Ligand binder design. Structure first.
Ligand SMILES: CCCN(C)Cc1c[nH]c2ccc(OCc3ccccc3)cc12
Lengths: 126, 128, 127, 127
């Protein structure tokens, strides 16, 4: 059971996540400028109040390029629930030296975005 | 000899596989203690001759089996195997649950599957 | 700076009943804590939010250890609206200032895992 | 279906072949328990156009757990060309089918890391 190294971004709007070119990568003090590349993956949740199945807000999780449930996807690949972000100067290489997070060892880092980053409408962390 | 799941199946309707966050996913079984609440779901696909004549896939069914029981009885919790997802309730025991075993439909109906109250399901899955 | 939060994820309720737990269970699992620190309270949290509607949202309940959180000064079993108390046998009725509260900018919340063999009332769910 | 090693490859740059002492050569895998630390290295040679001919690139050697990989039905110590066996003190002679092998579509490879104090034969590095 792997997980993301960060906490999710919650979606209240009706449009998918979409960062502008150059921003969207979570801050990580252990990574290098070469690693600032990856993708957000949407995860939907449904529960049972008495109207059978209820649809909750989807949450988006970030995974470094070459890691996570779509580790084999190349940067830019079009897939529902996947959006791509990168910081200029990042290498288009897989980041298998970072990998994914094991919850039984490390806890999720609080996702923080760089100064000046713009989140789309209806997107908030925690 | 040839036994079935103790519970009815969860039918896959969406494009996602059946996954469960930690703690949730184990079907309600009043005849079992909280030590037994641990097992796996095994996907079972069915193919049928479609309206054209070529075989078509039916909606996948997911059958729950307690740990150490069912077709993958000889597998430990968290094993990596396609079509096998693992569920456990906080406080379960990582031991084979032979005392429960598997069902013989000749003398035992299937328990209708029911999930704990407030269980998160992926899209395409429904909790009764 | 100056951000205070619960150490655990919230217990949302979509039913019409308030939160209650039978005696001995109701504290969430925390690996970095001792059985002596298994005593605290749940606090209520109201909220509102298609367009053109002031939608009344479902209330949540955040767990705080005894002597911490927005009601740190309250003693165990104190009577106040929106506040219910939980504890397990073998816990000390002492303030858990060494556990404190969570800074949501440095540490992420711990997923609310109830005790081994504890069922929440109808209308409640964890997320 | 088609799967690859869970780790990256040890590339043979010299003429010597892999050989480990009693209790060394198992890569560091946190998910695996001391029960599972047993397996084998399989040599994977690659051919390329030399520029005129076929040139055998420096053979990469991938590690697969016992029972997993392209050599499933082989027990520990099985003698076969291109296979070297490795164990750790306190493990079991069991087909580790619960570990399996990696689908690169949804899993990155773990960087092959060896415990502190491990010895290696000539020409061996991890890239
Ligand atoms: C809270 C869950 C935290 N655990 C991580 C879940 C877990 C419990 N038992 C496991 C056995 C295997 C596994 O991943 C399969 C695997 C990974 C890497 C290499 C080979 C095989 C994950 C797990």
């Amino acid at each position: 059971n792997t997980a993301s190294w960060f906490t999710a971004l919650t979606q209240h709007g009706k449009e998918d996540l979409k960062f502008p070119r150059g921003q969207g990568v979570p801050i990580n003090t252990n990574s290098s400028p070469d690693d600032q590349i990856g993708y957000y993956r949407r995860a939907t949740r449904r529960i049972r109040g008495d109207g059978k199945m209820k649809d909750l807000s989807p949450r988006w999780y970030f995974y470094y390029l070459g890691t996570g449930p779509e580790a084999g996807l190349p940067y830019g690949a079009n897939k529902d629930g996947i959006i791509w972000v990168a910081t200029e100067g990042a290498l288009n290489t897989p980041k298998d030296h970072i990998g994914t997070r094991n919850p039984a060892n490390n806890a999720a880092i609080v996702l923080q975005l760089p100064q000046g980053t713009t989140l789309p409408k209806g997107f908030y962390a925690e």
